[PDB]
Every structure is written in C-alpha cells, then in structure tokens.
C-alpha cells in the first residue's frame, strides 16, 4: 500500500483548537510521504500534477479522532486488527491501549508502523499491572508488594516493545472506594518507564488511588476522582511525571451505562449498583472541577466493555458537555489536539498543519452544531492512507439501549 498524494478541496474545516475556529472553503494537499503539504483557501490553491482530486464541497473535515484508553479484545491477531480496524473506521486515527492480553498489539502496532497493514497509530500498553484481584483478567501480577517486583514487571513490558503503561492503582467502578497498589510501587513503575519515554496510565477511582499515583509520577489519571486543592496543583505540576504534569481521561463513556441501565440490563448486583454510583457521582464531579482549573483533559472510553462499542468515541465527547461543562468546540479541541499532547505525539498529529500527518476525519455536517455528526464519518484518512470502507459495523441494540440511556 502506497501513499498516493491528493488533495482535498472546498471543505469547510473545524480546526479543533481551543477556540472552535472553522475555516471555509479550504484545500487540504497531502503529500506522498503521508503528510499536510499545504492547508490553504481553494481558490488560490492548485492542485499539483498527478495529485489525486477529492472533492469535499459540502463536507467538514477535522484531525482525526483519538481515544486514550482502548482495548482490542472484549484468533487474537485477527481480533485485535479487527477491533482496531472498526475504530479507525469510526474516525480513530490514534489510539492508546490499556491492557493488552500479551503483546499482541504491540506485533499489530509494528506491522501498521512498516506500512503493511491499515490502520490506526497506536500507542501500545501490553499486559496492565496490578495485583491480581481473580476475576481471570490478564494482566501481570504484583504480588510482593516491593518496588523491585514492580520495576522488573515494568521491564518485561519494556522490552517487548510497548509505548505506554497500564497500572491498576484501584479496583474498578463497580469496586468500593478504598482508603492495594503503593505509592512506592508506582514510583518503581514509573521511573523505569520514564526513562524510555514511555508515558504511564494508573486507574483511578477513588481520591486515595488518585493521590497516590500522581505522588509516583503517573502521567494519565483514568477515570478518576472528585478533587480537592492539593490533587489539582499535583496534576498542574508534577515533578515525577515525564512532562512535569498529569492529565485526566474521565473516561465517562465507561461508568455511566452501570448507572443508568437497570441491573435487568447490566447483570452487576446491587452492591456493585451503589459502589457504581458512588464512584461514577466522582467520576463526573472530579471532570467538571478540572475542567473549571483548567487542567488537562483528554478523551478515552475504555473500549471492549460490554456498554461501550468500540466505535463509540463520539459518544465521550456528547458526554464531557453534558456533564463536565464543556462545550463542543472544547470537547472537540480535547479528542484532538489535547489528546494529541497527552499522548506524546502532537508533534506529528492532532491537528490540520503543513508537516504533520494526514489524519483526517471527514464529515457530512458540523459537529460544532452537532456532536453526533461524529458518529457516521464520510472518510477517514489515516496518516494520508484513505479508508476505502464504508464505515463501522453498528450494533443495533446496544446502540439502542445507549441512545435512550443518554436521552
């Protein structure tokens, strides 16, 4: 598969900055390395010989999308490419999985870096850690409790090859808010992970979880906690993070079906309902108030949950306006450039500029009028390869008990 250069005229684009800017009537060249040649008004833009022609009147193209906390698995390989298959089909041009089962993904990862197979950049965890709670989940096991064993655990990830670091730092939603993974344990992980520039994810879901972790020098809190004033200056400045501070992924799209979903629907028990609304209440308070501190906020779902399709990335950003008081050009400026940052790799994606990769989200309408806009791309254009496909295949009935939960 070769990059054929092409440009794509008369588009409206929706920027994703902070400020919600658009520009209109707008041609986007992208050259045969894969990158933004020219971003510039159509009329004054012509079209290099021998430069595919796309034709985008009528259409609003954006950066492509970017989830920060995905799965690839609910044999393997072709699970793994088919999953992340449907979330750049949903418009994903960059994903970031936490929890592999092995290093199934970072094999897939490779194969997309080399050029032989499509599909989205991704930011590979391998197997999360934490201390195995037996619920048959994969991970690797901290049993000792010693900061060597977690060191050495690290290690092992490190030298299969991954680009970030899943840590369990609490148990998870439906888990009772504790007041478990040490402050020392962390620190091991991230110190050793830090010096292979690889960024490190704990999930949080307790104030505790989350001080702890951002004390180790965690770079992504998910899903998270309410805050206080010391928790936000941690995230502002943290000295032990890679880049000296920490983001949050709210990840709402991941506790809000155990709340408002009958348990007829869900199957969890009623103390896992309380412990799940206790938690998710946190969840959402905690984004709201560092989202009012202007800290940094980025967008994941955490895919491969039973309520949460691996195409539903649009639905995180309807739910940071409607509950952590964003508004769509911020929600959309999160999915995109904040994501980007977040990550590590805004120096290559996350926004429509000359250099940058061709990741290019194609719309048929406005989602600043819109979020759901999101939902049914017109095209995709990852790193300046177009999907030729028509789009993610849907599940009728769980989009229909989501819908009618979020109404």
């Known amino acids: 598969p070769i990059v054929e250069p092409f440009a794509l005229a008369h ?3 929706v920027t994703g900055d902070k400020a919600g800017t658009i520009l209109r009537n707008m041609t986007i060249v992208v050259g045969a390395d894969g ?11 012509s079209i ?25 698995f609910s044999y393997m390989a072709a699970t793994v490419k088919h999953n992340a298959t ?10 970031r999985t936490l929890g592999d089962v092995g290093y199934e993904v970072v094999t897939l990862r490779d194969q997309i870096d080399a050029g032989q197979i499509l599909g989205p950049r991704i930011l590979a965890s391998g197997p999360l850690m934490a201390i195995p709670e037996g619920h048959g989940a994969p991970l690797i096991a901290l049993t000792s409790g010693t900061p060597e064993e977690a060191r050495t655990a690290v290690a092992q990830n490190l030298k299969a090859g991954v680009n970030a670091i899943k840590i369990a730092a609490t148990g998870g939603v439906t ?18 992970a830090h010096q292979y520039g690889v960024i490190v994810g704990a999930h949080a879901q307790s104030p505790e979880g989350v001080r702890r972790s951002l004390l180790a020098g965690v770079d992504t809190i998910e899903h998270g906690s309410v805050l206080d004033d010391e928790l936000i200056g941690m995230f502002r400045h943290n000295p032990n993070a890679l880049r000296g501070y920490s983001a949050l992924i709210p990840t709402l799209s991941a506790g809000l079906p155990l709340t408002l979903l009958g348990q007829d629907v869900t199957g969890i028990t009623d103390i896992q309902l309380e412990n799940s609304k206790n938690v998710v209440g946190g969840m959402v308070s905690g984004a709201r108030q560092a989202h009012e501190a202007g800290l940094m906020i980025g967008v994941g779902t955490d895919t491969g949950m039973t309520f949460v399709p691996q195409y539903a990335t649009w639905r995180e950003l309807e739910l940071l306006v409607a509950y952590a008081g964003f508004s ?3 929600a959309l400026h999160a999915a995109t450039a904040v994501n980007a940052s977040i990550l590590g790799v805004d120096a290559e994606t996350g926004s429509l500029e000359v250099g940058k990769s061709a990741d290019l989200l194609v719309l048929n309408a406005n989602p600043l009028d819109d979020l759901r806009a999101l939902e049914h791309p017109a095209l995709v254009i990852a790193a300046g390869h177009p999907v030729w496909r028509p789009g993610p295949k849907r599940f009728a009935d769980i989009d229909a008990l989501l819908d009618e939960a979020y109404a």
């Not at 990158?35 to 833009?45: C, D, F, G, K």
């Not at 290099?48 to 995905?70: R, S």
């Not at 750049?88 to 041009?93: A, D, I, N, P, R």
């Not at 888990?175 to 050793?192: F, H, K, L, P, T």
């Open 328 to 330: 769509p050009a911020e």
């Open 11 to 13: 588009a409206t684009i």
């Open 48 to 72: 290099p010989a021998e430069y595919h022609y796309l034709d985008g009147t009528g259409k609003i193209v954006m950066p492509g999308l970017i989830n920060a906390h995905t799965h690839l």
């Open 175 to 192: 888990d009772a808010q504790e007041i478990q993974m040490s402050v020392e344990q962390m620190r091991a992980i991230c110190d050793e």
């Open 35 to 45: 990158r933004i040649e020219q971003v510039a008004p159509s009329i004054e833009t």
């Open 86 to 95: 449907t979330l750049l089909e949903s418009g994903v041009t960059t994903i």
